[PDB]
């Protein structure tokens, strides 16, 4: 599946032009986590994953290493954290550009692969 190759491209780009919806993307998921009962040392370490997961992936493409940097956000754009994250936002902002092109790469990826082998961790 080498389509979800290229939609974690598209939403690595967008985290990367847009560090104002990246600050709010990963502050977003630990409310939801919140919802859910989760303990607040597993919140600040998912808040840490998908922070850490974009930096290394960014850092690479910044170094001519797109090939590593959509391999380490595909990780993130399968991620339920990541899914949390642009779910929170969603419905605060239904209209919003930059939640919507980043959710339809990922709404698109989940169709174009289907991966299962672990999960939370």
Same mark, same amino acid.
């Given at each position: 599946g080498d389509e979800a190759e290229k939609?974690? @491209?598209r939403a690595l780009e967008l985290v990367?032009?847009?560090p104002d919806l990246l600050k709010?993307?990963?502050e977003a998921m630990a409310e939801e986590l919140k919802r859910q009962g989760?303990?607040?040392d597993?919140?600040?370490?998912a808040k840490d994953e998908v922070k850490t997961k974009v930096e290394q992936a960014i850092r690479e493409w910044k170094q001519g290493?797109? @090939?590593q940097a959509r391999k380490d956000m595909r990780k993130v754009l399968k991620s339920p954290a990541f899914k949390q994250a642009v779910k929170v936002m969603e419905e605060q902002e239904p209209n919003n550009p930059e939640v919507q092109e980043l959710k339809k790469a990922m709404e698109e990826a989940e169709r174009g692969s289907l991966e299962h082998h672990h999960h939370h961790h």
């Open positions: 939609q974690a @491209e990367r032009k847009s709010k993307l990963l989760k303990s607040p597993e919140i600040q370490k290493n797109e @090939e």
